[PDB]
Every structure is written in structure tokens, then in C-alpha cells.
Amino acid sequence: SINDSKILSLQNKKNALVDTSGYNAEVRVGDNVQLNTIYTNDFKLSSSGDKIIVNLNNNILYSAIYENSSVSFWIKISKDLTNSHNEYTIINSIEQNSGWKLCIRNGNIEWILQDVNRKYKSLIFDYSESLSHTGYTNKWFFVTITNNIMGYMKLYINGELKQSQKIEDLDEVKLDKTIVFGIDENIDENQMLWIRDFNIFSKELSNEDINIVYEGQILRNVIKDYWGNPLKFDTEYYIINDNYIDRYIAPESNVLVLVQYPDRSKLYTGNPITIKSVSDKNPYSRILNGDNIILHMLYNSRKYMIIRDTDTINCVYALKLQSNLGNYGIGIFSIKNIVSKNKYCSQIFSSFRENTMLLADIYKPWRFSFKNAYTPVAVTNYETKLLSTSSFWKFISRDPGWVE
DSSP, rough: GGGGGEEEEEEEETTEEOOOOSSSSSSEEEEEESSSSSSSSSEOOOOOOOOEEOOOOSSSSSSSSSSOOEEEEEEEOOOHHTTTSSEEEEEEEOOOSSSEEEEEEEEEEEEEOOOOTTOOOEEEEESTTTTTTSTTTTTEEEEEEEEEEEEEEEEEEETEEEEEEEOSOOOBOOOOOOESOOOOOOOOOOOOOEEEEEEEEEOOHHHHHHHHHHHHHHHBOBBBOOSSOOOOOOOEEEEEEBBBEEEEEEETTTTEEEEOOOSTTTTOSOOOEEEEOOOOOTTHHHHOOTEEEEEEEEEEEEEEEEOOOOSOOOOOEEEEEEEOOOOOOOEEEEEEEEEOOOOOEEEEEEEEESEEEEEEEEEEEOSSOOOOOEOOOOEEHHHTTOGGGGGGGGEEEOOOOOOO
């Protein structure tokens, strides 16, 4: 019933982006704008002059805003766009003086509401955090703006209130007629962003309702890559542990260990792992909670299957490589999303012989050496470790919004 207040909803139907709210907005998508590349209702703004123009079919009696409203969408902003010190306008309903716009500047997003006299209020969120791993550069995040025209305008990120500004003190704000998505500033190659699930609601959404929209649109049962894209079979990933973000998985004497990145700033470091569907789901299909999966590592140009050791190092098993590919239980795993607003990560489990969960910590995993290593291991009796970040894994794909 939250959805009952939708008065614009941009969704992909029969390979076109249209308004499915019922209100019949005209949606004019630029010829070069790529739709539905990651998520069904997404669009990518990446080439010079990429635009989507939405012409509303709305109230003609009221010249000025007469009701509360909310705007929601997810956004993903490339590294190269984020690294710019320049300001870019991304969405804009201002034709003359009044209206709203979304801007990006130096790793911040800014929402502005402006009245007929160009008096404005601003809400800002630092999504980049100076390109920190903990930030959101090139990661999907959920934005929601709510407007109480006799009160406050609020900015939420992933359902969490970030900023609030009074707007009751503004003068006249005209009803929107046209909304333009697209950057007019000159852009370089690789400066791109994606938006998905753009909606406008005819009410001020409560925090509770915003969390409902968020939870619904995140797709709880679809495993996510590091950027928040759906995880896919048959796709290369650099798999990292949340406790050791600058270490890569590698075989040493056929025991997998975590090796420190020679350069922390180069994400694509290590031995790419491809995930295979045990049940023969279609090539490149999405990986879901409850899927049986197999992991293949590319090591010095050769493919191996990752398996659990048969023998222990409260059992603890190291992981190893096997050149013989096939469906062996000792190499079958399953992946489950962790519910988290600030991390796209999952746990990995094995039910071969005993129930185990993969985590990373310091062990002595070799049979003929007492040397320590940061070691991914499969551990039994893991109930007390279910909230441990040592059990959280992230999957870094080579993504067009992060170029090295």
C-alpha cells in the first residue's frame, strides 16, 4: 500500500523504460542510453549527451506544490566521476526558477530544493569518504528524499536519516512538469553512473515505509558482488575477507592463504575465481541464497577447483586446489547474504560430512611447517561466529565503473 501513493515509477517493460504508476508520464530515452544492464529498471548515463526526459501528465489546477512528496532511487557512481573536483548536475526539474535537482561534486551528492525566488535548501551526503573501502564509490546505494511542505525535507541513505532542512520557510515552489536525467557538463571516458528504480510518491514517507521500499528493492535473496550488483555464475571475482581487505587468496604449497596486496589501491589483485552452478542454471545467471556452487580458481593461467581438506589442521579444515574438475561434495559450497547497510558481503558454507562455515584468521595450516598464515578455513560448530566479520566475504568483479 506504500506503492499506492506512487505517482511516477520508471520501470522496464517490453525493453523500454516507461512510467508504470498509471499516470502516463511521457518518458523519452536517449538513443544511446543503455537500459537494463545490471538491474531490470536501471539506466546508465555514460556517453556525452545521454539523457532521459520525463514529461509529467499532472495537476493543472494548482500552479504551486500542494502536497507532500517523496523521491526514491538507487544510484551507483563510477570512480572516475567521483574523483573529479567538478560539479555535475544529474537530475533536474528546474526549468525557470523553482524546482529540485541532484548534483554530484567531489564525492558528495547534493539535493537542492529551490523556490521561485531562487531561495534554496540543500542536503548533502559524502558517499565517497575519500575513496575509502568503507565508502560507496561505484557501489549501489539507496537514496530517499522526503518533503513535508509545511515542515522538513529529509535525506535518507539506505533507510538511515542523514540530513534534514526546513522547507516550510521557502516561498512558492511550482509543480514539476519536466524532469531531466543527464549530465550537461563535459565528461571524460569512464565517467559514468547508473540509476535504478526511480519513483515519486505523493506523500512524505515515514522512516518505516522507506525501510520497506529499501528491503524490497535490494532483492534479499540475490547474492551481491562488492559493488552491489547481482553475483553471477561464470564470472571472474577477486574474493576477499572482510577482516583482511588488502589480502588476496593464493595457493602456497597447495594450501590457500591470504597474501598482502603489494599496492592496497589496486583492487584487482590476485587469482580470479569463477563460480559454477552445480544444478546447471543458465550461463551467467544470478546466484541466489540456497544455490549449490563450485569455485574455480585461475592460477598462473590454469583452472583448479577449490576443495576443503579432508583432514583437520571444533574441527578446522584448510582449503586446497584440485585439477580434476567435477561435482565432488568436498568442493560444493553455498552462499548466503549478510544483511548489512554498509557492506555487500556473504557467508559461505559447506555441508560435506560436517557442517562448516568459511572464515579467515591466523593458523598454522601446513603439514610440514610451523609457519603462521592468514588462512581461509572451514570451521565446525560455528554458531558463535555467525556475527563475526571474519566470516564475511566480498566478491570484487571487474566493473566498468572502476577502471584500473
